[PDB]
């Protein structure tokens, strides 16, 4: 009987869809993480961070969840499904529909100033006298990459029958590309190309790897470009870094909608734009490129996407 005891266990098994108007002869395939319990890739880590914290006793009945953040919407539905209280912090700058959703899920919301971005959101460590609160810390909590190592990567391996050659993923916390790369490279033993994507507006991974001045900047690609290197980004399994600009990312997401019939978020367009560039290099012509589409476009109705 495939009946889940609560919504948190229904995470993953997202589909692979071949692109028709990007890439070269179908070499670009997308993984639609929009099709998850709270409709983003973060559902996977919202569940596992809560699960793991239960497993080692730091999360118990009567403790209240805290973190800074789609991760919020993920933790909120998990908190609701499993019966936890939850306070959150989010940059004010994020789309209204994720603001609106959190309130309906029972969250104690606390917006933070947009100019300070995620660093400002992480005004959350402030929040956690302990004993009552527990902060889950998505940017460094290893339970974030390991759910991707346990489910998302294996889903990609199985659905491609081991044929995946390249994985393209935008980087926020870095959990996705880390767990996925570790699974396919270390668990399944295949030397793929792991491609991190970041905004050209805030290319801190590129600058770091080049031994250059780290200069983050503001951008419109919600989800990625934290402005620093997160602990949950394993630089050692990253083979390549692609940068993408906001306008192109937006245009690409619109194209996914109107030309492919795929309802994808802003960061999904960035990831595909990056993948499309690699896919049109002759060196990648015989390569199957798998691209993570982290979220769905209805969570961006209030944004420059529409």
């Amino acid at each position: 009987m495939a009946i889940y005891a609560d919504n948190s266990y229904s995470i993953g098994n997202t589909p692979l869809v071949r692109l028709k108007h990007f890439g070269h002869n179908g070499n670009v395939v997308v993984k639609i993480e929009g099709r998850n319990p709270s409709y983003s890739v973060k559902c996977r880590i919202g569940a596992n961070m809560v699960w793991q914290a239960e497993k080692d006793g730091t999360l118990t009945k009567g403790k209240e969840i805290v973190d800074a953040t789609n991760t919020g919407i993920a933790l909120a539905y998990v908190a609701a499904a499993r019966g936890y209280k939850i306070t959150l912090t989010m940059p004010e700058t994020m789309s209204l529909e994720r603001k609106r959703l959190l309130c309906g899920l029972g969250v104690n919301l606390v917006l933070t100033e947009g100019a300070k971005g995620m660093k400002g959101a992480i005004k959350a460590e402030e929040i956690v006298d302990p004993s009552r609160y527990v902060m889950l810390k998505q940017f460094e909590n290893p339970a974030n990459p390991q759910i991707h190592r346990e489910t998302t990567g294996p889903e990609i391996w199985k659905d491609t029958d081991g044929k995946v050659d390249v994985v393209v993923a935008g980087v926020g916390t870095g959990g996705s590309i880390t767990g996925i790369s570790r699974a396919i490279k270390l668990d399944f033993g295949k030397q793929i190309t792991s491609v991190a994507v970041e905004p050209v507006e805030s290319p801190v991974i590129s600058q770091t790897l080049a031994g250059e001045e780290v200069k983050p900047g503001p951008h419109k690609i919600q989800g990625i470009g934290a402005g620093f290197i997160p602990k949950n980004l394993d630089l050692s399994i990253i083979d390549r870094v692609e940068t993408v600009d906001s306008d192109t990312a937006l245009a690409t997401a619109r194209r996914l909608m109107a030309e492919e019939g795929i309802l994808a978020g802003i960061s999904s367009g960035a990831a595909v734009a990056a993948a499309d560039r690699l896919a049109k290099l002759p060196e990648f012509a015989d390569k199957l490129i798998v691209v993570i589409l982290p979220s769905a476009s209805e969570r961006y109705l209030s944004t420059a996407l529409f």
Partner: peptide
Amino acid sequence: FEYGDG
């Protein structure tokens, strides 16, 4: 400040 820079 769009991103934001943090």
